[PDB]
Design a protein around this ligand. Structure first.
Ligand SMILES: CCCCCCCCCCCCCCCCCC(=O)OC[C@H](COP(=O)([O-])OCC(O)COP(=O)([O-])OC[C@@H](COC(=O)CCCCCCCCCCCCCCCCC)OC(=O)CCCCCCCCCCCCCCCCC)OC(=O)CCCCCCCCCCCCCCCCC
Ligand SMILES: CCCCCCCCCCCCCCCCCC(=O)OC[C@H](COP(=O)(O)OCCN)OC(=O)CCCCCCCCCCCCCCCCC
Ligand SMILES: CCCCCCCCCCCCCCCCCC(=O)OC[C@H](COP(=O)(O)OCCN)OC(=O)CCCCCCCCCCCCCCCCC
Ligand SMILES: CCCCCCCCCCCCCCCCCC(=O)OC[C@H](COP(=O)(O)OCCN)OC(=O)CCCCCCCCCCCCCCCCC
Ligand code: HEC
Ligand code: HEM
Ligand code: HEM
Ligand code: HEM
Ligand SMILES: COc1c(O)c(C)c(C/C=C(\C)CC/C=C(\C)CC/C=C(/C)CC/C=C(\C)CC/C=C(\C)CCC=C(C)C)c(O)c1OC
Ligand SMILES: COc1c(O)c(C)c(C/C=C(\C)CC/C=C(\C)CC/C=C(/C)CC/C=C(\C)CC/C=C(\C)CCC=C(C)C)c(O)c1OC
Lengths: 41, 55, 49, 240, 68, 76, 98, 373, 24, 184
């Protein structure tokens, strides 16, 4: 419940959490995905 | 063929038999009435354009 | 069509016929001229050439 | 038309996310360089495409500098030949296709750059054709410069059978059996016709992971915003 | 030292199967037929295509396990 | 636009807030029965044309092959 | 013919949404004139039935089998009013024709 | 801003029927596909050269040397295929649910369909492969069928005795310019529709139950866009050549003819019809009618119910129509020989007889069953 | 009048309290 | 009729001031010039090739071998000049008579002016003459002025170290596509 009241209720903060998360998601996704592809081939 | 005018220019030589059958062909019974010699100055020599009347 | 098989409907058309022909004529002349159709234009004495 | 239909072979890149075996592409490039380059051309493939796929920068540089390539008009105003550069494309066997017609008994050996892509079921066809020079059966007779390859259209390919067991020696030492050579050159030609095969499949794997993440979440958002209506209860209350 | 092309060993091992030997029997009869009839235009391709289709189908079932 | 679309009377309409209701109420609970209910009301109208397309397609293929197959009696 | 008409009425499937036959008519000019001439209670029942059918099609549901519209029960209410619209329409057309 | 009003009037506060199924997504998908095609087409146009010496070389340079150029090219090709898939399903939705009674919207639609087919034909000519050149000659030859002015017209389009560079360059110009006309015609298509509003699968007046579009049919269109992108990227990244022809990867040889000439699969139904009619002209006409029969469709509606939700006999006839459309798509592929030909001839006869004759008679019978006729 | 009937039950819809709202 | 309604409200009955002078013609002229350019541009596009080996050859082939191709090419060039004459007089009318108080119309106008200038610049690069190449390098170089991302941007547009075929082809694509955005 805290998160909603902190980063998901104010739209500005909603955007902040989205942008920041996306900034890191790429790192994680690419890394994880690559691991999988490599393992496959 | 020499691709004359951007289209295959078929140039052919015919055999005694080849020339003999084409004459035997029924001109009237031909889909297009044009006896072999009608399209050739030389029986041994036939020249055609390679575009199917169809498409 | 039921409504169009009518007496006045026919009268209207008859009255409208002449005008219609005129319009086709204009177009026909137009097509002949625009396309420079020579088959037809060759008949006209002056237009020839 | 009536033609033998090459069977399906269990290729290492046949799978949905299965990439190419790059040692096989290197061996097939060696097969092309030592056998297939005498008649066939590779006009859309350069030596710099081999860097990071089969060879390093210095190995591909040595491979490019082994050959000679006319390159530009000398200041004196004339042609001259220079050692190939990583930017040079693969050398022509013939300066023009009419020389190929004259040298190959009227037949034109086609560009092998996209042969696999241009031939229906290419990878298989290629393998089959190269390994399908069987004896013509009774009733069929072929003229000189022709060979009964069931797979080839008409079964009369001008190309003589180019892969005799131990035709060339693989630098890797893998036994150079006719087949091992046909499979390697089919992998290589495949690579040639699609140098991006590997990169793409990685993009497809990332696409499948992203769609598996995003489709249920967008479905959940749609079902949130559509639940309201999907629960709406209507009641008719005539005043009566 | 003959370098064995696994393809050859797989090829006669696949010709030992039953559909291949039946098609080869028609092939033989067919070819004998064409041979027997001195002047004819009846080729054996269809038979030969059937035999090659069955044989290369079972070859392509198990060829690539012997290739590095 | 809205307001001038239609005239209804005495039709009460109740509803709930999205966040107040479960997102997928009995999704597979009734979804399956319904999807199955649906398929049985439309399968007899939809499927038999595609069934006879499959038969015609196979037939054509096989017939074509037989057509291509050499006439044994011919050439002998 | 009566039983086969009941079977076709079940196969049409608008009774499963609680609709009448006259609810399923395409609203042309004559149909809208016939709908406008309806009394208020019949019009209100028609609009509620159409709204309920649209809601059921939204949720991909049908009514329970006890709530379906029995072929025998369906009432052709708009029909009487419609014939007139067509009759009047034709009369006017004929007048113009002549 | 006044524009915001227009922005709202067509996408936010537009009253839409609450019960429209996923089929109503497809037209929006078509618009997205149009943009996608335009965007990918623009990024093909920065490296493509419309010269017969260099067109194949430029396409190979796009695939091999431009960064992710293979991605944009195969996205363009499979997006054309996705465009025709969504177009066929959009037209099938319009035929099934009685949406052709919106006559102006339907006629602007069939104009859009003709424009999209012409754009895809010239675009397939553009890479200048073996298959493109022989395909172009073939259809350009189709025009020669015209009784009197045919030869001239063909030569005009070709720009010479036979398709050659003259054609390629003007086909590049026309293939560039027509999708913007398609976008303008789509704007006219949207206008002629909002005047009347969309139809619903029950075919009834949905004025009592309409909802906004922003939160209800926007997230639905976003989900449909995501699913269509999933199918497009699994078509591009996994099977990039299952819908194309291998012979298009050879350069255009005027001397060498292919053993079997096809257009791309979405032209097949038409191809079958053309081949079926013995007379060349007949084929061309029937072919045209094949597409045009649709325009003719709003005058053939003889039922008192708009949609086919409550019409089972016409539902059966509709699915038989979809069935022999699939049959005509298959036949086009098959070569010229027994019995593919007869099927083609029948399938075409059955197609025209179901659309022209069987559906209005069935609608009359269905009106008779409900004690309406 | 307007009180004859009560809001229909949404229990099969309703989830199972501001305490929860924040989470919801 | 929902398509004809637009015209009636916009072109046939629109209430216009009775006393507007000939200067108010000019904007309509601009629209006509736009079409003229598009039409002439389309008939240049059926023979032009955007290859640095063949662009000058294709332009000379248009002028010398295409029937009335010199007419369409010089109509395109002088129609670009006529477009800028009518554009300058349209902007001068807007400045003189206080028409800039229609602020949204004025801002859409200055966006149109930027788009037309970019279109004419890339179109002048397109024939690949001596003057086109040195002109392109010059203005592309203008971008390099950008304080931090300038170099990259220039190289991006050029598509390489220096303007070369990479540029010509993308300039052909952009010069083709921008007049439709100008029409919208
Ligand atoms: C069957 C097994 C599942 C089941 O029984 O659940 C019940 C459910 C049926 O429930 P119902 O009460 O009968 O109907 C209400 C729907 O569930 C209400 O939901 P819906 O299915 O109408 O959703 C709207 C529809 C809208 O669909 C579209 O947007 C289609 C767009 C065009 C087609 C896609 C583009 C490409 C087309 C290429 C051809 O979206 C879907 O079709 C499903 C999207 C799933 C996304 C991935 C989720 C994981 O089954 C499904 O929902 C099937 C679809 C999801 C699986
Ligand atoms: C494919 C089968 C899709 C399917 O599920 O069929 C059943 C469905 C039932 O629809 P309906 O009876 O209206 O009820 C729906 C609401 N309960 O029926 C439908 O989904 C109707 C779908 C209408 C559009 C179908 C388009 C199919 C492709 C047509 C391509 C050719 C179109 C003509 C080209 C010329
Ligand atoms: C039809 C006889 C009666 C069947 C009764 C079945 C039991 C009904 C009662 C129990 C409930 C079972 C499920 C009910 C689902 C909904 C009701 C239903 O499906 O009814 C049967 C259906 C529609 O029936 P209806 O339209 O009322 O009248 C039949 C007219 N023949 O009609 C059908 O289901 C059969 C449709 C058959 C269509 C065959 C089409 C074959 C031709 C395809 C050609 C494709 C192209 C071929 C090549 C062309 C070019 C060469
Ligand atoms: C050139 C001279 C044109 C001229 O005749 O100037 C006098 C004219 C008087 O106009 P006015 O006083 O409004 O009275 C008109 C009705 N009797 O005043 C005018 O004609 C006003 C014309 C307004 C538009 C003039 C555009 C001239 C060219 C401007 C190019 C640069 C525009 C800005 C670019 C940034
Ligand atoms: C290395 C082992 C190869 C491979 C993989 C292929 N070839 Fe050749 N080839 C040559 C000639 C003269 C032709 C044309 C013959 C004709 O058209 O009649 C060919 C053709 C091919 C093809 C195309 C088959 C088709 O259907 O078009 C393919 C896929 C192919 N070859 C594969 C000549 C030669 C050589 C000179 C004697 C040698 C060496 C090679 N080819 C080697 C190879
Ligand atoms: C205005 C936007 C568009 C532009 C600028 C454009 C541009 C191009 C270019 C340059 C090519 C050649 C590159 C290639 O070979 O792929 C091409 C090919 C093609 N385009 Fe477009 N296009 C546009 C819109 C469309 C649309 C809307 C369609 C669909 C009707 C389409 C269908 C095709 C097809 C089928 C090809 C051939 C692809 C292939 O080589 O297989 N284009 N386009
Ligand atoms: C260029 C491709 C096309 C685009 C972008 C397009 C766009 C759209 C859009 C956005 C809609 C509204 C949303 C919807 O109902 O799906 C729509 C509806 C419609 N379109 Fe199209 N369309 C295209 C092709 C066609 C064609 C070819 C036809 C004619 C067969 C057509 C006929 C219709 C009809 C009848 C509707 C109304 C749907 C209904 O109320 O049932 N469209 N189109
Ligand atoms: C979509 C429509 C258009 C197309 C297809 C098009 C196409 C072309 C082509 C192929 C050329 C090169 C041929 C030549 O050298 O003249 C060209 C040149 C040119 N275009 Fe366009 N154009 C279009 C619209 C415009 C517009 C609206 C303008 C004005 C802003 C314009 C300005 C120019 C200029 C200045 C040249 C250079 C002419 C010269 O060589 O002196 N074009 N255009
Ligand atoms: C509610 O009714 C509407 C509606 O109001 C609108 C505007 C659209 C239009 C939606 C789209 C996003 C399609 C885009 C259509 C175009 C104009 C294509 C043109 C493409 C461009 C290049 C721009 C609908 O599809 C629709 O029904 C669902
Ligand atoms: C009365 O007020 C108006 C007015 O109503 C209109 C529509 C126009 C528009 C007139 C034109 C013919 C200009 C054309 C404008 C375009 C949209 C250019 C787009 C070009 C195309 C390729 C189409 C006016 O110029 C005008 O003031 C005189």
């Amino acid at each position: 419940s805290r998160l909603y009241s902190l980063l998901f209720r104010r739209t500005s903060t909603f955007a902040l959490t989205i942008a920041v998360g996306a900034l890191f998601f790429e790192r994680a996704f690419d890394q994880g995905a690559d691991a999988i592809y490599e393992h496959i081939n | 063929a020499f691709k004359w005018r951007g289209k295959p220019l078929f140039v052919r030589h015919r055999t005694k038999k080849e020339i003999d059958q084409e004459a035997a062909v029924e001109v009237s019974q031909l889909r297009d009435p044009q006896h072999d010699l009608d399209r050739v100055k030389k029986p041994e020599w036939v020249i055609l354009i390679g575009v199917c009347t169809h498409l | 069509l039921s409504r169009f098989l009518g007496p006045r409907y026919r009268e209207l058309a008859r009255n409208w016929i002449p005008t219609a022909g005129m319009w086709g004529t204009v177009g026909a002349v137009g097509l002949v001229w625009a396309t420079d159709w020579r088959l037809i234009l060759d008949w006209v004495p002056y237009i020839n050439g | 038309d009536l033609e033998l239909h090459p069977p399906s072979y269990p290729w290492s890149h046949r799978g949905l996310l299965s990439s190419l075996d790059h040692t096989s592409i290197r061996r097939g490039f060696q097969v092309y360089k030592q056998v297939c380059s005498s008649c066939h051309s590779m006009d859309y493939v350069a030596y710099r495409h081999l860097v990071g796929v089969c060879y390093t920068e210095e190995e591909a540089k040595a491979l490019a500098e082994e050959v000679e390539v006319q390159d530009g008009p000398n200041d004196d105003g004339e042609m001259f030949m220079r050692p190939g550069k990583l930017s040079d494309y693969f050398p022509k066997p013939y300066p023009n296709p009419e020389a190929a017609r004259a040298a190959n008994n009227g037949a034109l050996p086609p560009d092998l750059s996209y042969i696999v892509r241009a031939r229906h079921g290419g990878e298989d066809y290629v393998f089959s054709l190269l390994t399908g020079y069987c004896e013509p059966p009774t009733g069929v007779s072929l003229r000189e410069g022709l060979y009964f390859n069931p797979y080839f259209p008409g079964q009369a390919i001008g190309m003589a059978p180019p892969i005799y067991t131990e035709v060339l020696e693989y630098d890797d030492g893998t036994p150079a059996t006719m087949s091992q050579v046909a499979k390697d050159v089919a992998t290589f030609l495949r690579w040639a016709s699609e140098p991006e095969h590997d990169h793409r499949k990685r993009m497809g794997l990332k696409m499948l992971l992203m769609m598996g993440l995003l489709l249920p979440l967008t479905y959940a958002m749609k079902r949130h915003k559509w639940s309201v209506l999907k629960s709406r209860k209507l009641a008719y209350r005539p005043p009566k | 030292e003959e370098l064995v092309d696994p393809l050859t060993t797989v090829r006669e091992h696949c010709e030992q199967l039953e559909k291949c030997v039946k098609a080869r029997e028609r092939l033989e009869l067919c070819d004998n037929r064409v041979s027997s009839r001195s002047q004819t235009e009846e080729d054996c391709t269809e038979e030969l295509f059937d035999f090659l289709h069955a044989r290369d189908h079972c070859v392509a079932h198990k060829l690539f396990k012997n290739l590095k | 636009e809205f307001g001038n679309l239609a005239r209804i009377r005495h039709v009460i309409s109740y509803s709930l807030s999205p966040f107040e209701q479960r997102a997928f109420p009995s999704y597979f609970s009734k979804g399956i029965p319904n999807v199955l209910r649906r398929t049985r009301e439309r399968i007899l109208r939809v499927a038999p044309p595609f069934v006879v397309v499959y038969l015609i397609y196979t037939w054509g293929n096989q017939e074509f092959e037989q057509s291509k197959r050499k006439n044994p009696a011919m050439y002998e | 013919l009566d039983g086969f008409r009941k079977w076709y009425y079940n196969a049409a499937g608008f009774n499963k949404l609680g609709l009448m036959r006259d609810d399923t008519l395409h609203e042309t000019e004559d149909v809208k004139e016939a709908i406008r001439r309806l009394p208020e209670d019949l019009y209100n029942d028609r609009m509620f039935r159409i709204k309920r059918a649209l809601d059921l099609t939204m949720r991909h549901q049908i009514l329970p089998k006890d709530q379906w519209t029995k072929y025998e029960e369906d009432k052709f209410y708009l029909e009487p009013y419609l014939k007139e619209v067509i009759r009047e329409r034709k009369e006017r057309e004929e007048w113009a024709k002549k | 801003h006044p524009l915001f009003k227009i922005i709202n009037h067509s996408f936010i506060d537009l009253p839409a029927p609450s019960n429209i199924s996923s089929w109503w997504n497809f037209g929006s998908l078509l618009g997205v596909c149009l943009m996608v095609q335009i965007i990918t087409g623009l990024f093909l146009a920065m490296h493509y050269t419309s010269d017969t010496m260099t067109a194949f070389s430029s396409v190979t340079h796009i695939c091999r040397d431009v960064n992710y150029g293979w991605l944009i090219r195969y996205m363009h090709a499979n997006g054309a295929s996705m465009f025709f898939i969504c177009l066929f399903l959009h037209v099938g939705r319009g035929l099934y649910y009685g949406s052709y009674t919106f006559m102006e919207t339907w006629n602007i639609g069939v104009l859009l369909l003709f424009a999209v087919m012409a754009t895809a034909f010239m675009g397939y000519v553009l890479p200048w492969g073996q298959m493109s050149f022989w395909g172009a000659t073939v259809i350009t030859n189709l025009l020669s069928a015209i009784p009197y002015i045919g030869t001239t017209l063909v030569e005009w389009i070709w720009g010479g005795f036979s398709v050659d560079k003259a054609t390629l360059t003007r086909f590049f110009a026309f293939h560039f310019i027509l999708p913007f006309i398609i976008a303008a015609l789509a704007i006219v298509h949207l206008l002629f529709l909002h005047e009347t509003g969309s139809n619903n699968p029950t075919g009834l007046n949905s004025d009592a139950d309409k909802i906004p579009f922003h939160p209800y049919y926007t997230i639905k269109d976003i989900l449909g866009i995501l699913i269509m992108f999933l199918i497009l990227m699994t078509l591009v990244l996994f099977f990039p050549d299952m819908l194309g022809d291998p012979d298009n990867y050879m350069p255009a040889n005027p001397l060498n003819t292919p053993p079997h000439i096809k257009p791309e699969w979405y032209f097949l139904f038409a191809y079958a019809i053309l081949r079926s009619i013995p007379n060349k002209l007949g084929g061309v006409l029937a072919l045209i009618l094949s597409i045009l029969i649709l325009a003719l469709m709003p005058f053939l509606h003889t039922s008192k119910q708009r949609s086919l939700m409550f019409r089972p006999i016409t539902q059966i006839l509709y699915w038989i129509l979809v069935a022999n459309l699939l049959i005509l798509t298959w036949i086009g592929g098959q070569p010229v020989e027994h019995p593919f030909i007869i099927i083609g001839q029948l399938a075409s006869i059955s197609y025209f007889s179901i659309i022209l004759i069987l559906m209005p008679i069935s609608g009359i019978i269905e009106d008779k069953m409900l004690k309406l006729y | 009048s307007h009180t004859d009937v009560k809001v229909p039950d949404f229990s099969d819809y309703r989830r199972a309290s501001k305490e929860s709202s924040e989470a919801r």
